[PDB]
């Protein structure tokens, strides 16, 4: 059972996303169901060890944000073009 | 190899130790292939592939199972003397094959303690009950 | 003490063109290299290569313990082949059947090294497969 | 001696050493594997 921490993004856009990935982070979003989309930001080195498992893209993950277990699945991922890093992850609510 | 499968290789000592009563010892200053074959080619004409010629005489491995079973062996952790637990026997006839191979091209690393199964002395009691 | 095995089959007694200087190194005269080679060679069936152990005692004498011929020649009578394996995977020579090895497995269970005949059975499987002749 | 911009362990008994600011490959089994970076 993967558990991932997350804070809610204050600022959004092109320059703010560049400014997170410098500081060992990357933005994500959770979308699905009756509830609005939730734009969160993740820690880069914690997820990059989890993502190297083939069990990551098949199980129902749990993101903890503002004290709330949200059970989502990995829908899409943007990888860096030549560095082994992560740019952005989509999550669809389970 | 990781420690959990080593933790059944402490269990693998026990049931060999539990069944075995008589044990003879050796060391290797000049460990030859054939100097261990002298006791195993001799073993096949008597019994099976039951026996281990491997060593467990390390400062935690045969030390922990010693208050468990056969408590005299908690002193021979160091000083380079190993264990080979033959499963049957009661003062059997399988002693000097590690020891007579010392005279035949080996330079005496063992000093042949004898394991004291009737709690005997260090002298070889070559009487063998037929 | 140099107990290595070097001769050809029975038809060449005192075999100076096959042996040469090989067993002729020591101070032992050749009259017990040729005629005391016949204590096992003419003692059985001729023509087949018996290896013989020479350990040179200090009194110019020797004794030995006999054994079976190699995995070529006792299997060569069970093959009949003359050239061994001429490029097997690019064109085949033949094969060795498994069940024919039983007669030799009950033959060589006297001196050949070990007590488990069944463990010697898969020993002559892959050894027969080693000869270009897939068992 | 070999003098090369690329020096390497060529066999199993080659040791890479740095003496006075130069990477050298000194060997003990083979005299042909001795090297000096240049």
């Amino acid at each position: 059972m993967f558990t991932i921490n997350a804070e809610v993004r204050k600022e959004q856009g092109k320059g703010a996303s560049r400014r997170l990935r410098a500081a060992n982070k990357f933005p994500a979003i959770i979308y699905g169901g009756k509830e609005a989309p939730l734009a969160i930001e993740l820690d880069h080195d914690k997820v990059m060890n989890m993502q190297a498992k083939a069990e990551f893209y098949s199980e129902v993950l749990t993101i903890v944000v503002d004290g709330k277990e949200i059970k989502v699945k990995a829908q899409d991922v943007q990888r860096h073009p030549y560095k082994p890093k992560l740019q952005h992850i989509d999550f669809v609510r389970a | 190899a990781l420690n959990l499968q080593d933790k059944q290789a402490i269990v693998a000592e026990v049931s060999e130790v539990a069944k075995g009563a008589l044990s003879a010892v050796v060391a290797d200053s000049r460990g030859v292939t054939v100097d261990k074959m002298t006791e195993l080619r001799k073993a096949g004409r008597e019994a099976g592939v039951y026996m281990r010629v491997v060593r467990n005489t390390l400062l935690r491995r045969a030390v922990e199972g010693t208050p468990f079973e056969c408590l005299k062996d908690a002193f021979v952790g160091p000083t380079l003397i190993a264990y080979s637990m033959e499963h049957p026997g009661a003062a059997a006839r399988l002693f000097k094959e590690f020891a007579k191979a010392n005279a035949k091209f080996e330079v005496k690393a063992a000093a042949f303690e004898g394991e004291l199964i009737p709690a005997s002395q260090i002298d070889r009691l070559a009487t063998l009950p037929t | 003490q140099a107990y290595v095995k070097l001769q050809v089959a029975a038809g060449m007694a005192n075999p100076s063109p096959p042996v040469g200087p090989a067993l002729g190194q020591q101070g032992v005269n050749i009259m017990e290299f040729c005629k005391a080679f016949n204590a096992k060679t003419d003692s059985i069936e001729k023509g087949l290569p018996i290896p013989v152990v020479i350990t040179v005692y200090a009194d110019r004498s020797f004794t030995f313990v006999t054994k079976t011929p190699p995995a070529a020649v006792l299997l060569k009578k069970a093959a009949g082949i003359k050239s061994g394996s001429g490029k097997p995977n690019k064109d085949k020579v033949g094969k060795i059947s498994r069940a024919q090895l039983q007669e030799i497995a009950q033959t060589k269970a006297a001196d050949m090294t070990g007590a488990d005949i069944e463990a010697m059975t898969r020993s002559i499987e892959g050894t027969a497969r080693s000869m270009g002749l897939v068992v | 001696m070999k003098v090369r911009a690329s020096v390497k362990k060529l066999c199993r008994n080659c040791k890479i050493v740095k003496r006075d600011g130069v990477i050298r490959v000194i060997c003990s089994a083979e005299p042909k594997h001795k090297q000096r970076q240049g």
Partner: protein, 136 residues
């Protein structure tokens, strides 16, 4: 040497080579040779790096070449002045951006494909890195 069988036009402008690459995932095989550098690969460079990885795996496996040279390059000869036309087509290139998987392979152990994409990276003028197939 790879080359188009036909072109609509014989010549082309020079252009620029900015941007990131598109064929970034390993699509077909299991392992890749991704481009970290920028530049252009001529057809003699693409094909010398193919003979070096084909020989290294001993005709056992399957190789993909993800890039094709289709930009013709002109040159003017020696002792020719600057006007009087555009030069004659001399060779063919492929324009490479950072993030381009160049070659692919499967059907080999991963340790054999480390060492064949090393003997073939030697013949290329851009800096490369070894990638594998990812799940999503």
């Amino acid at each position: 040497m790879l080359q188009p069988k036909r072109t609509k036009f014989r010549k082309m402008h020079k252009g620029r080579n900015r941007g990131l690459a598109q064929g970034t995932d390993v699509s077909f095989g299991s392992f890749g040779l991704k481009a970290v550098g920028r530049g252009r690969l001529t057809a003699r460079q693409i094909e010398a790096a193919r003979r070096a990885m084909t020989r290294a795996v001993k005709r056992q496996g399957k190789i993909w070449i993800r890039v094709f040279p289709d930009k013709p390059i002109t040159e003017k000869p020696l002792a020719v002045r600057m006007g009087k036309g555009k030069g004659n087509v001399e060779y063919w290139v492929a324009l490479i951006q950072p993030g381009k998987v160049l070659y692919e392979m499967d059907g080999v152990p991963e340790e054999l494909a480390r060492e064949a994409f090393k003997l073939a990276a030697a013949k290329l003028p851009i800096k490369t890195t070894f990638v594998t197939k990812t799940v999503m």
